[PDB]
Amino acid sequence: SMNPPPPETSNPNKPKRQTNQLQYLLRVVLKTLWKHQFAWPFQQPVDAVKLNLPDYYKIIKTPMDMGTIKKRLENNYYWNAQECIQDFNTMFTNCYIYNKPGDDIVLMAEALEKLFLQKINELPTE
Ligand SMILES: Cc1nnn(C2CCNCC2)c1-c1cccc(Oc2cc(Br)ccc2Br)n1
Ligand SMILES: [Cl-]
Numbered sequence: 405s406m407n408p409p410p411p412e413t414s415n416p417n418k419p420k421r422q423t424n425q426l427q428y429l430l431r432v433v434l435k436t437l438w439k440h441q442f443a444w445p446f447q448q449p450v451d452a453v454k455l456n457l458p459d460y461y462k463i464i465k466t467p468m469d470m471g472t473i474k475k476r477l478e479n480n481y482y483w484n485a486q487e488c489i490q491d492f493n494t495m496f497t498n499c500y501i502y503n504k505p506g507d508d509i510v511l512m513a514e515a516l517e518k519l520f521l522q523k524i525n526e527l528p529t530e
């Protein structure tokens with residue numbers, strides 16, 4: 405197919421945790437970023453058929469998006485907060501890798517990344 409399968413959101417053998425930091429990543433970080441005016445391109449996997457981008461998955465080999473992250477958090481997919489943070493990082497970096505400095509989508513990712521970093525500086529630590 406032209407679209408690869410989307411990243412998994414379940415994996416029965418993988419060991420899982422529920423932690424306060426992961427709960428905060430869902431309730432506060434993800435759900436706030438989700439409502440930002442620039443969130444919509446990032447709310448679902450890139451559909452290369454819909455978007456007419458036969459090169460997207462030629463370039464991006466570790467796709468990630470906030471819809472996948474949301475489902476992973478809801479399904480308790482992660483072991484720890486850093487694992488989820490890594491998925492956000494992959495999503496932003498993919499956008500920079502596929503696009504160009506100054507593109508509208510890159511301006512959006514830059515703004516979202518700054519907001520993300522601001523929110524993860526407030527991760528509960530106690
Ligand atoms: C993520 C992501 N990373 N790159 N892209 C496009 C950006 C445009 N070029 C091809 C790659 C997306 C993406 C995902 C869903 C919808 C969507 O829609 C657009 C958004 C803008 Br802002 C501008 C134009 C479009 Br179409 N873009
Ligand atoms: Cl647990």
Ligand SMILES: [Cl-]
Nearest residue numbers: 453454455456
């Ligand atoms: Cl199309």
